[PDB]
Symmetry: D2
Subunit: 455 residues, 4 copies
């Protein structure tokens, strides 16, 4: 049901076990914003699963063999051949992380006035697309926008919406389809192989490109393995390779499913696009032979991507997240459903139904969680959504959530219990959670440095 | 009652997740002796807690700062001042591990024909003592020999036995008292501060020296803090320092409670002893300034000893072992009680009541455990006890046990569940466990390479 | 005049010691382009000093203490306070390397149609400037363009050129002065404190901002200490701090003078600029708290920058490069003069007077060097200058050089002898060096993958 | 003539570049005993070549893959098969370093009253032999005792002396021949393959065992390669394998020619001796599967022994030592000749001919060297020889030397120049070097902690 860790602990990270009264003082000095907390003051840090992973002994051995050459590094060649073998693409261009690849992709594939259609969007990626003159069109299935609906493969593209876009704007006016795995804005929801294939088939008929934003493609492959009929005798590597056989290229954040602390890459099949990518990469990242990465990180990412294909590893990764969500759900705590590959999202609108969205229920719940347990979580609600600079009004997102984001191979089920038990205890007296108000609000990037006090 | 790990995972060790049928084949190739298994074939290796610990990030940082100089190394100065501060002895001599320190002590403190008395013995230490012409006398309380008996501080010395020795032999004929913390042969049982005090008082009145075999002294300090009334307001460090204030020196295995993979030391207060120690260490270990250790290992051990003093670390260490024993006990599995600081010992006599000791129930239980779970454990019974050289018969120890020895900071509670669940399942069909017989018996060190088959 | 290395070797990098005949075959497989050689096939790799530095034991210890948190990392706090202390700017924004910082600066400080004036340019930086709609104006002193001329502080700005710009265009039409230390295109030539002061005085009177492209600022500080009268009693740190006191901010490549393999940052004093910078960094690099770097790399760079301030380190760094140039000069080998902080540039025009620039003397000299010595160097001539897109003709740069670029702390004087002796032997038979012609020319970034054969 | 380093520097060790006046104060605080200096205060530490070597990137990768299992570690298996392949022995028993192997060997191979004959002796080894009741007989050729005689293979055994021993005491009374490579007491002098073979042939005829004390066997193999006719087409590995084909076993210090900071082993062919060794190793070192070493050190030593076979590495190692000796000799500085594989010995009796041996010319010269250059060297003269405890008189050795002992891969030719130039300058005013007298003399191990002041 829940497997034990399919690894041993090789080394540990020292933590301060500061008690409740001291955590409250830290939380106050941070202005009740978990983004302002010092890492040294946090027991369990679930701010993000990006770049926070534990590497293996084998990756650390790789880190000692960094070949730091500007061109022709053995580490580059190892990353290159690993990604060619596992993802099946012709050309690989390393980037320092995922958004560096997206910056390149947008410049390579978008003419101004064109549409980019995808299964929801990621803030930075959408910025790059719009900066290049594209209009983003969301073609995810309707169910994805219903955070309570417990159904499989909620990340799937609605083929009818894609069909309508093609009919209305013309294929030649579509830059590409951006297919994300898993889908962030729906809570880490997977995409079925059936959907990927149907998308390939429709787009190919019209000459439209498909590029994958593949940041959690291994979590995705695990869901296919577990839940899509016909995949029960297939290895994770076999599923991953098939997934990408339905794309023209991809952007990858090594920092997520490649089990590293930094790293990414851009893949493609097209020789002309590759030629062009080589010129752009130099401008923003570095030579095509390192792409803004140390040789030791190309090595660590080549090693980690291969480790990610081990069935027992990814099964455990996803079931650990699931354990946390199952324990919360069994106690009545409201969460986004189904639980995603990388995180559990608390529904803070429902958890704190006595608070208005203007009193920042997600921000306040995240503060309470830290004070009660030493666990840091991320506000993913009204604060992060930011203000409308035209009107001065909050953007008021339908999702008012606290994200419990789980780094790979860092925490145990007992840490998941610390998280769950603390949240369950807060839920039992949820009416006591106080609202927040700004005492300092930056004009930009307000989630990162805003400060609050209790109402 | 079971705390979460008070640390995060920094790096992981890759393990083979081989299935049962393949484990059976490995166990057979190892002639059903867990000592012959390949490390690469083992999921959870509970052969020993000695030298198998996960280091922290801070120790690994120290490992990069190895000052490898033959004399005057910063790492030696760091180790020296750390031991002086935390153990309180005037002089420190590094050794490659504990038995190197015991080798020196035996040569420095024993005249031919004297007695060494202690709370049970460690095999290699008794060897050194006798090689220097001492007779060993066991002065442990009788309860220590009763595996099933659940009493606190089972490792305590019987002061009446001590008194009897003094009266029968004379004080001038006792080289020293060797007080071990914790006590191996009783299953990792602790010694109280009251006993250490009373032993010191009686010996000092007679001019008899006391040396500690301090290999799990921090586990011991934890039992004092948790269970000895009057110690509830003391830090682990205050307890450790007080323990050593009742001794003239110690031998230490850093491989156990200093959280390293290699290292030990000898401490004393006496200047003349220290001078003679310097001459001896050179011949067996290395110069007094490194003692058969790399500079980086003196550094790791200096760091590790200070980390061991953190309450939450040692509370978790001991309660994790306790969890494994509690879960086994709740299912009716016979174990040595109370659970020790470092291991749970299955009582194979009671587990396999249908087998005679001559059929090697501990060896066979250890084999079945590996086959069912991927867990390696150590035979600590008739096989390890070896053969009588005069009579040709087995030494037949009273305790016939399988030792589930827990490395520090390597495993989680979910690993403990893997161990417990597999042993509980075996216990539910205990009658099916088959006796073993030798098919190859070496003349010396037989537990290491002997091979068996089922009767 | 040449000091010994002010450090010891902690660890070594394994290299191939392949003989001449095998090097010839590698060079041929690389189509006589050193950019295509495999790192594993190179004994001494002088392609670049960027990112190829040997770190110390103390940096590697810092690498073990990577605090990988998305915000609030101890490593970010260490980098931030180190830069504030040593460079003296209010605000620091990490970037994955220098061109990431330049990308942000160009977007923050340039309005369409303004001029950026500087002492020559770096290709990628000029690209960003022009992409933001600036026209670049070179205000370097004329001597900087005269490769053979041996004068001090060749990188200095011509203040009369600056004055002319201000009078012809108006101050409101100058976005900023970009002052580079040291100056790449003049061969690593330094800028005096007097010039930095005079530039600041003139610009400040007109309300024009100054930003430093500070990639080899510590090499530059060394030239000031050694050669600018009045600086003989100042530490390298005092010099660096004073240099930056004449600027409104900087872009930094830690990959050069901060002694690391990856990393950079952007600094500024202005609060509004810092706020806008935070929004931009997120889209291109990462959160302002890591900027596209692992925590361990922020830590290494923080450590490396402080190590760079040690006089003996930077004295040795620069005098080791000088030794290679002095030895070449003493044999009559034509080089750019004075020798720069980081590289010796062979003047391939003078080396191969029997070849026309259209026969690619620098490319061919670089090839022969590898074949004769196992040493890789970079073509910095007509090939790297690329092709005119309008006319289809080569850009024909005045300087046609081979760059012998020296990574910090990687090589010894005996390696420099290997380099010099092989080049002196080639020079003794310079007439034998054959012209090259393309057999494959890419349309973009041609120096990276172009292939040649002998005419 | 002198090759460049056949490696690059991967990482560096930070040094204090304290000037002359500060070094003098340090030297004073150390009581003019270089053994008392702090490592942090030394620029170039030539105290010993034992355990001070720089490891490769590949060895450091190995260090990250330590398999710390008590038995069946992959690292043990790698060391085992590497030594079997390269040295040709059947059985390998790791030990923490060389003297641990010697302790075992003496107990395994000596009956009381027997003779051990060798080519000179090593202090700790002779202690082990005598402790087991053997009498040591020196059978080195006469020339070895003439430190000025410039001849090849000065370490050779005199077959006539071995013949005489056999005739006089009987073969059955000879425990074994201990053949050392290279020979320490003669200044690091090699043994020819011809001599090894002649020794094997004579001993085999009489049934006498031969064991090699093989600590610098790779330096030895390089001398055979360079100077013994018939070995010019043989690889270093081929010579090493042949050397050991003439022994029954060996003791090895990894700390010298295996390029590690700790580690050693005992080898043998005999099954019964191996069985016995297994019992003893447990008592003094650890299980036969780790022998007092961390798994990562067995791995580092397995890797390093293989790296030591590279021709260019060992050629450079030996020629660097030679460069130092050649430079000294060319200036008239008196040294032991020929220069050995690992060190240059200054003849301090000749260097300081105005001082009596009672004024400690070697100790004083070593102090002067440190003050003038920051270089630490070892006294190998009257101080180290110690006192006769029966008579109270100094042992007065024929060799009164300062040992300039060179760690492998740590220093450059420029460091060798710092050493040489300083010594050459001291030589030019040698009459000014003052004698020393004790102000504090320990009863034991006096070289390690004695303190002096100037006469
Ligand atoms: C994380 C993510 C990115 C950005 O990658 P980074 O490595 O964080 O820059 C882009 N797209 C998706 C779908 C992501 O999940
Ligand atoms: C482990 C132990 C030893 C031996 O120490 P090592 O480090 O294994 O050599 C000696 N005495 C006791 C009581 C021990 O626990
Ligand atoms: C190296 C350099 C850059 C680019 O920095 P990277 O770290 O290579 O991106 C920009 N400007 C100057 C003056 C440089 O020297
Ligand atoms: C160094 C040496 C030893 C001792 O080895 P360690 O590893 O220092 O204990 C023994 N014999 C010879 C000939 C040596 O050179
Ligand atoms: K990170
Ligand atoms: K170990
Ligand atoms: K690099
Ligand atoms: K050492």
């Amino acid at each position: 049901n829940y497997p034990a860790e399919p690894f041993r602990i090789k080394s540990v990270e020292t933590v301060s076990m500061i008690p409740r009264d001291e955590r409250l003082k830290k939380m106050q000095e941070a202005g009740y914003n978990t983004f302002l907390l010092n890492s040294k003051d946090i027991y369990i840090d679930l701010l993000t699963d990006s770049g926070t992973n534990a590497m293996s002994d084998k990756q650390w051995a790789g880190m000692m063999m960094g070949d730091e050459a500007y061109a022709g590094s053995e580490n580059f060649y190892h990353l290159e051949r690993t990604v060619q073998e596992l993802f099946g693409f012709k050309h690989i261009v390393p980037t320092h992380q995922g958004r560096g690849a997206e910056n390149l992709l947008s410049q390579l594939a978008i003419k101004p006035g064109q549409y980019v259609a995808g299964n929801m969007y990621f803030t930075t990626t959408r910025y790059h697309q719009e900066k290049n003159g594209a209009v983003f069109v969301d073609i995810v299935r309707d169910e994805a926008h219903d955070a309570g609906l417990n159904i499989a493969f909620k990340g799937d593209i609605d083929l009818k919406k894609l069909q309508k876009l093609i009919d209305e704007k013309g294929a030649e006016n579509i830059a590409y389809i951006c297919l994300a795995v898993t889908v962030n804005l729906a809570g880490g929801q997977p995409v079925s192989m059936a959907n990927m294939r149907a998308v390939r088939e429709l787009t190919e008929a019209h000459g439209i490109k498909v590029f994958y934003a593949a940041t959690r493609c291994v979590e995705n492959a695990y869901f296919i393995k577990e839940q899509e009929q016909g995949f029960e005798n297939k290895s994770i590597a076999e599923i991953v390779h098939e997934m990408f056989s339905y794309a023209d290229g991809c952007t990858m954040s090594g920092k997520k499913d490649c089990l590293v602390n930094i790293g990414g890459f851009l893949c493609m099949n097209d020789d002309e696009m590759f030629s062009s990518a080589k010129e752009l990469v130099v401008v923003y990242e570095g030579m095509p032979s390192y792409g803004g990465l140390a040789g030791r990180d190309m090595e660590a990412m080549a090693i980690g991507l291969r480790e990610a294909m081990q069935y027992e590893y990814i099964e455990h990764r996803v079931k650990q997240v699931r354990y946390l969500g199952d324990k919360l759900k069994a106690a009545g705590v409201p969460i986004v459903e189904p639980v995603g590959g990388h995180a559990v999202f608390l529904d803070a609108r429902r958890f704190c139904e006595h608070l208005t969205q203007d009193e920042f229920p997600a921000q306040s719940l995240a503060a309470s969680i830290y004070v009660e347990t030493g666990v840091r979580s991320m506000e993913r609600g009204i604060i992060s959504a930011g203000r409308n600079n035209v009107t001065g009004e909050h953007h008021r997102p339908k999702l008012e959530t606290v994200r419990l984001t789980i780094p790979r191979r860092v925490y145990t089920y007992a840490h998941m219990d610390v998280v769950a038990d603390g949240i369950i205890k807060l839920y039992q007296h949820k009416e006591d959670i106080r609202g927040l108000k700004f005492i300092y609000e930056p004009k930009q990037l307000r989630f990162f440095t805003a400060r609050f006090d209790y109402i």
